[PDB]
Each structure stands twice: as structure tokens, then as C-alpha cells.
Design a protein around this motif. Structure first.
Motif, PDB file in Angstrom:
ATOM      1  N   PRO A   1       0.788  -1.240   0.000  1.00 15.59           N
ATOM      2  CA  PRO A   1       0.000   0.000   0.000  1.00 15.59           C
ATOM      3  C   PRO A   1       0.824   1.297   0.000  1.00 15.59           C
ATOM      4  O   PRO A   1       0.603   2.181  -0.834  1.00 15.59           O
ATOM      5  N   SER A   2       1.767   1.414   0.930  1.00 17.48           N
ATOM      6  CA  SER A   2       2.594   2.610   1.008  1.00 17.48           C
ATOM      7  C   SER A   2       3.435   2.816  -0.267  1.00 17.48           C
ATOM      8  O   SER A   2       3.796   3.948  -0.609  1.00 17.48           O
ATOM      9  N   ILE A   3       3.732   1.730  -0.975  1.00 21.48           N
ATOM     10  CA  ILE A   3       4.504   1.817  -2.214  1.00 21.48           C
ATOM     11  C   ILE A   3       3.581   2.239  -3.350  1.00 21.48           C
ATOM     12  O   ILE A   3       3.978   3.005  -4.229  1.00 21.48           O
ATOM     13  N   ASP A   4       2.352   1.726  -3.337  1.00 25.15           N
ATOM     14  CA  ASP A   4       1.371   2.089  -4.358  1.00 25.15           C
ATOM     15  C   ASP A   4       1.129   3.598  -4.283  1.00 25.15           C
ATOM     16  O   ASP A   4       0.954   4.265  -5.302  1.00 25.15           O
ATOM     17  N   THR A   5       1.123   4.125  -3.059  1.00 24.46           N
ATOM     18  CA  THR A   5       0.897   5.545  -2.821  1.00 24.46           C
ATOM     19  C   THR A   5       1.954   6.428  -3.470  1.00 24.46           C
ATOM     20  O   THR A   5       1.630   7.460  -4.053  1.00 24.46           O
ATOM     21  N   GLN A   6       3.214   6.018  -3.371  1.00 20.88           N
ATOM     22  CA  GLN A   6       4.313   6.789  -3.937  1.00 20.88           C
ATOM     23  C   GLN A   6       4.409   6.630  -5.456  1.00 20.88           C
ATOM     24  O   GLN A   6       4.750   7.577  -6.167  1.00 20.88           O
TER      25      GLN A   6
ATOM     26  N   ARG B   1       1.891   8.796  -6.978  1.00 18.42           N
ATOM     27  CA  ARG B   1       2.303  10.188  -6.910  1.00 18.42           C
ATOM     28  C   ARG B   1       3.262  10.490  -8.067  1.00 18.42           C
ATOM     29  O   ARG B   1       3.299  11.610  -8.577  1.00 18.42           O
ATOM     30  N   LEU B   2       4.043   9.493  -8.471  1.00 20.67           N
ATOM     31  CA  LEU B   2       4.969   9.658  -9.593  1.00 20.67           C
ATOM     32  C   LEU B   2       4.127   9.781 -10.854  1.00 20.67           C
ATOM     33  O   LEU B   2       4.481  10.492 -11.793  1.00 20.67           O
ATOM     34  N   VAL B   3       3.002   9.076 -10.862  1.00 24.04           N
ATOM     35  CA  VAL B   3       2.096   9.126 -11.996  1.00 24.04           C
ATOM     36  C   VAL B   3       1.446  10.502 -12.052  1.00 24.04           C
ATOM     37  O   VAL B   3       1.213  11.027 -13.136  1.00 24.04           O
ATOM     38  N   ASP B   4       1.159  11.087 -10.888  1.00 21.48           N
ATOM     39  CA  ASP B   4       0.550  12.417 -10.847  1.00 21.48           C
ATOM     40  C   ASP B   4       1.516  13.442 -11.434  1.00 21.48           C
ATOM     41  O   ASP B   4       1.125  14.282 -12.238  1.00 21.48           O
TER      42      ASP B   4
ATOM     43  N   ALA C   1      10.525  18.755  -9.619  1.00 29.98           N
ATOM     44  CA  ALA C   1       9.754  18.146  -8.534  1.00 29.98           C
ATOM     45  C   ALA C   1       9.611  16.637  -8.716  1.00 29.98           C
ATOM     46  O   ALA C   1       9.685  15.879  -7.756  1.00 29.98           O
ATOM     47  N   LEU C   2       9.393  16.217  -9.958  1.00 31.31           N
ATOM     48  CA  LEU C   2       9.255  14.808 -10.294  1.00 31.31           C
ATOM     49  C   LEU C   2      10.570  14.099  -9.968  1.00 31.31           C
ATOM     50  O   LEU C   2      10.588  12.959  -9.483  1.00 31.31           O
TER      51      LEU C   2
ATOM     52  N   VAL D   1      13.769  10.434  -6.309  1.00 33.74           N
ATOM     53  CA  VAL D   1      14.913  10.129  -5.465  1.00 33.74           C
ATOM     54  C   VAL D   1      14.478   9.777  -4.031  1.00 33.74           C
ATOM     55  O   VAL D   1      15.084   8.930  -3.375  1.00 33.74           O
ATOM     56  N   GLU D   2      13.429  10.426  -3.546  1.00 36.63           N
ATOM     57  CA  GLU D   2      12.966  10.148  -2.194  1.00 36.63           C
ATOM     58  C   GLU D   2      12.220   8.819  -2.118  1.00 36.63           C
ATOM     59  O   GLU D   2      12.294   8.131  -1.108  1.00 36.63           O
ATOM     60  N   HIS D   3      11.520   8.463  -3.192  1.00 37.35           N
ATOM     61  CA  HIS D   3      10.792   7.201  -3.257  1.00 37.35           C
ATOM     62  C   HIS D   3      11.810   6.064  -3.345  1.00 37.35           C
ATOM     63  O   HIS D   3      11.593   4.970  -2.805  1.00 37.35           O
ATOM     64  N   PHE D   4      12.908   6.321  -4.052  1.00 35.38           N
ATOM     65  CA  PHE D   4      13.972   5.337  -4.189  1.00 35.38           C
ATOM     66  C   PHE D   4      14.595   5.154  -2.803  1.00 35.38           C
ATOM     67  O   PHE D   4      14.823   4.036  -2.360  1.00 35.38           O
ATOM     68  N   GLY D   5      14.848   6.271  -2.126  1.00 35.18           N
ATOM     69  CA  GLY D   5      15.426   6.232  -0.792  1.00 35.18           C
ATOM     70  C   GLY D   5      14.531   5.530   0.217  1.00 35.18           C
ATOM     71  O   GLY D   5      15.020   4.912   1.161  1.00 35.18           O
ATOM     72  N   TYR D   6      13.219   5.634   0.021  1.00 36.55           N
ATOM     73  CA  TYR D   6      12.248   5.001   0.910  1.00 36.55           C
ATOM     74  C   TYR D   6      12.334   3.488   0.736  1.00 36.55           C
ATOM     75  O   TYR D   6      12.370   2.746   1.715  1.00 36.55           O
ATOM     76  N   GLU D   7      12.349   3.035  -0.516  1.00 39.39           N
ATOM     77  CA  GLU D   7      12.468   1.610  -0.799  1.00 39.39           C
ATOM     78  C   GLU D   7      13.798   1.095  -0.245  1.00 39.39           C
ATOM     79  O   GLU D   7      13.845   0.049   0.395  1.00 39.39           O
TER      80      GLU D   7
END
Length: 130
Positions: A11-16, A19-22, A45-46, A51-57
Motif C-alpha cells: 500500500p505505502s509503495i502504491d501511494t508513492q 504520486r509519480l504518476v501524478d 519536482a518529479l 529520489v525520495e521514493h527510491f530512498g524510501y524503498e
């Protein structure tokens, strides 16, 4: 963009990813309205967000000792490098260049999610991640 079974994940990954899709949609909006300053703004911004989504994973890889962390982080790293190159072309690019870049971003993201991120789902799910 739709959310097929392969794209799907924690779920938390689907959320990010959504957001990349947005951001991707926002980038298409700027080009559409032929606004290059807005397109460059959104791309920036994209970029930071990816980079932050990558860092989260990567933080999840660390936290749960994900076996394939090395390859995955390097794939993430190469794309950032690629995104930085694409970024320079927007300085003097036109709505056409924005669209071509946008297609590259989309092609990489969808493939990455379905083939690389999907590999860690079962692993993290069975360890209590959400």
C-alpha cells in the motif's frame, strides 16, 4: 494510470508510485499548455520525488535485509543519472522534447515497477511491512 496486478505492491509503495504518476500527468499538462517554465518546474519536482521514493524503498531494503538490495539500488542510481541528463535537455527544449522525455520516464517506470519492485513485495509483506 491503471493499477494492474504486476504494478500493484505494498500500500505505502502504491501511494508513492501513484504520486509519480501524478507528476507525470502534471508534466504532460505543462507541455500541452506549451508552458516550458512550468514543465521544467514539474520535472524538477518529479526528479526530487523519485529520489525520495527510491530512498524510501532502499530504507526498507536496509531495515528488512532484502537480499537483492544491491542490484536494485544500482538500477535506481542509473535512472537518477539518466534523469539528470534529460533535465539538461529541457533547458532549451520545446513541448516536443518534453513529450519524448515523458515517454522515456513512463517506459522506465512501468517496466521497473512490474519487474523490479514486484520482486520485493512478497518478501516485505511476510515481514509485516505495509
Amino acid at each position: 494510470v491503471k493499477w494492474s496486478e504486476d504494478l500493484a505492491n505494498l500500500p505505502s509503495i502504491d501511494t508513492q508510485h501513484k504520486r509519480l504518476v501524478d507528476y507525470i500527468n502534471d508534466l504532460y499538462r505543462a507541455a500541452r499548455r506549451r508552458d516550458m517554465d512550468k514543465a521544467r518546474e514539474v520535472f524538477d519536482a518529479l526528479k526530487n520525488y523519485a529520489v525520495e521514493h527510491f530512498g524510501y524503498e532502499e530504507r526498507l531494503f536496509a531495515d528488512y535485509a532484502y537480499p537483492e538490495a544491491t542490484r536494485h539500488k544500482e538500477i535506481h542510481r542509473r535512472f537518477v543519472e539518466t534523469v539528470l541528463k534529460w533535465e539538461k535537455q529541457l533547458a532549451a527544449g520545446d513541448p516536443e522534447v518534453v513529450m519524448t522525455t515523458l515517454r522515456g520516464l513512463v517506459d522506465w517506470l512501468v517496466n521497473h515497477i512490474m519487474k523490479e519492485d514486484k520482486k520485493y513485495e512478497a518478501y516485505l509483506r511476510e515481514r509485516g511491512v505495509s
